[PDB]
Design a protein around this ligand. Structure first.
Ligand SMILES: C[C@@H]1NC(=O)N[C@@H]1CCCCCC(=O)O
Ligand SMILES: [Ca+2]
Length: 587
């Protein structure tokens, strides 16, 4: 018995109780001659409750029967105060119902009887849930603003309706208006509510935050309401001058930027699972902001950090390709004849004819792996948009450390964690391709993959006998052999009289999948560019990835680098805030 079945049972049950009781039916049927005949002579108790704990007036308010409802208030004035006692509709009054249906004459009569406008409808159907078709809040004033009845809104205000009222979720009337379908109607209704504010610079209602720490303006950007977002921007932009077509306007740039841990409107847009919020980044106050942060200080640092990480990876592979080597000391090669093994694990690495040159490189691969963990592990909680680069980088350092833990214990399978570090470390270089967009990305994407897998394949078959399956006997041969395996020109390295290492079968399955996807993705990329304006859907995704990466770099970089966006106002003399100067042309 699901919860949706119960309300279906109750709604069917409610009609039964209305059908059974002749008083509830006459209120539903608007039978005035009955109500006097029902009530004045042997009247069933007027405080009668239905299946939902509704009063006879509550039923008279649902079906806009003003005349039947008027009989119920004159014969019994106490019914106006009574709220619905059922669990589903707990707190709702006859005033809430009359406001929804915009029955103005009944609303006017209900305030004449002093119906409390502070009545909170805390019922279950009024909860902000996906199984509820409408969310209007808990106050009758909030109901008036949502139905768009400006007449009821000011009328409710006249009788002392508090516009600062917050529901169970801490949402004000303004927060609720942004969560509405008809955005262009709510824009008119939104300005109506603001005029009734006290006008104090303090305690402004637009500053009252959601319980999740969201002002109405900030919530509009998170929710993706462009109409409200463009609307709420008029208050916070200032036009400096008008020079013919040119117009230099100054934007506030206060709740849109960063000195808040999660108060950044950018961080909220890039971390939310709302795909609709991706379009707020293209709005004219924001699109210039993110573009300036990327042009300078976003692009160079990404490339500066890019060359460092690239150099860090090749250095690590340089230690892997020329790692310790030992002959097959055991005569075990004859038993289990399938083995082509010349295993090469030794502990005489301290001797340094050229080994220290690897030791200092191995030390770099460790101090860089912990530095990698020193900047991503304290950065706990998680949304990937620019790529799963953060998921792969920590697993890489995990492998290097595990490979380091594998060392000194002299475990034979040192290749296993070391091979995972090669693919994971190199494939993260292809994430740097964001900084010729068509084809050339795959061109650099494909080059990284072989260097990540050819170098891996070389490590696995560095031990085995190159006479059988000698596809990667040389590192320049591992590169070329894996390069042509990328295009299926060469049949996959296979020999069945011997037993191959299990890392090859694992690495090849992972290589075969990627090689096909990139070749599959390349072909569509060629069509999708000349297919339709879907290229813009493919374009704005990358532009969002660039913005997501730009916000990523600004978190950990210190304050000495990457100065604050815009220009401060404290002398010139207009703000503790930072303003962005934008000028546009009109035609
Ligand atoms: C029609 C029912 N009868 C009644 O007296 N109140 C109910 C009103 C139904 C509104 C449900 C709003 C929602 O979906 O949350
Ligand atoms: Ca073949």
């Amino acid at each position: 018995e699901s919860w949706a079945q119960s309300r279906d049972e109750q709604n069917l049950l409610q009609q039964k109780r209305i059908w059974e009781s002749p008083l509830l039916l006459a209120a539903k049927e608007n039978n005035v001659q009955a109500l006097y005949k029902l009530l004045k002579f042997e009247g069933c108790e007027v405080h009668q409750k239905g299946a939902m704990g509704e009063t006879a007036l509550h039923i008279a308010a649902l079906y806009d029967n003003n005349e039947a409802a008027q009989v119920l208030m004159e014969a019994a004035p106490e019914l106006v105060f009574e709220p619905m006692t059922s669990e589903l509709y707990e707190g709702q009054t006859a005033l809430h119902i009359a406001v929804i249906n915009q029955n103005v004459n009944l609303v006017r009569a209900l305030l004449a009887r002093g119906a409390s406008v502070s009545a909170r409808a805390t019922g279950s159907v009024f909860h902000y849930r996906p199984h509820n078709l409408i969310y209007y809040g808990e106050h009758p004033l909030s109901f008036a603003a949502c139905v768009g009845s400006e007449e009821i809104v000011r009328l409710l205000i006249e009788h002392g309706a508090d516009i600062r009222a917050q529901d169970s979720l801490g949402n004000t009337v303004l927060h609720i208006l942004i969560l509405q379908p008809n955005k262009t109607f709510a824009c008119q209704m939104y300005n109506l509510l603001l005029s009734y504010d006290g006008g104090d610079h303090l305690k402004s209602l637009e500053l009252v935050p959601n319980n999740q720490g969201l002002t109405p303006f900030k919530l509009a950007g998170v929710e993706g309401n462009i109409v409200m977002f463009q609307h709420l921007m008029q208050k916070r932009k200032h036009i400096q001058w008008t020079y013919g077509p040119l117009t230099s306007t100054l934007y506030d740039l206060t709740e849109i930027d960063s000195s808040g841990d999660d108060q950044s409107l950018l961080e909220l847009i890039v971390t939310t699972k709302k795909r609709e919020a991706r379009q707020i980044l293209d709005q004219t106050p924001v699109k210039e902001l993110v573009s300036l942060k990327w042009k300078r200080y976003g692009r160079p640092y990404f490339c500066v950090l890019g060359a460092i990480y690239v150099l860090y990876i090749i250095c690590f592979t340089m230690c892997c390709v020329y790692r310790p080597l030992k002959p097959r000391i055991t005569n075990r090669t004859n038993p289990r004849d399938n083995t082509l093994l010349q295993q090469k694990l030794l502990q005489e690495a301290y001797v340094t004819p050229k080994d220290d040159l690897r030791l200092v490189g191995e030390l770099v691969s460790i101090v860089g792996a912990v530095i990698i963990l020193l900047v991503e592990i304290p950065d706990i909680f998680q949304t990937i948009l620019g790529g799963p680069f953060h998921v792969i980088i920590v697993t890489y350092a995990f492998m290097v450390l595990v490979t380091m833990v594998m060392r000194l214990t002299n475990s034979d399978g040192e290749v296993v964690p070391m091979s995972f570090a090669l693919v994971l470390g190199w494939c993260n270089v292809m994430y740097f391709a964001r900084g010729f967009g068509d084809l050339m990305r795959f061109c650099w994407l494909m080059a990284v993959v072989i260097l990540g897998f050819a170098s891996a394949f070389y490590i696995i078959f560095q031990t085995e006998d190159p006479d059988e399956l000698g596809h990667f006997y040389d590192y320049p041969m591992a590169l070329f052999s894996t390069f042509e395996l990328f295009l299926t020109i060469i049949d996959g390295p296979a020999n069945y009289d011997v037993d191959l290492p299990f890392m090859y079968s694992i690495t090849y399955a992972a290589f075969a999948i990627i090689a096909t996807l990139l070749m599959l993705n390349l072909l569509i990329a060629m069509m999708g560019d000349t297919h339709w304006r879907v290229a813009h859907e493919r374009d704005e995704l990358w532009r969002a990835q660039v913005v997501a990466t730009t916000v990523m770099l600004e978190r950990k970089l210190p304050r000495c680098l990457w100065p604050r966006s815009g220009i401060c106002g404290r002398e010139y003399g207009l703000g503790d805030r930072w303003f962005l100067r934008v000028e546009d042309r009109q035609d």
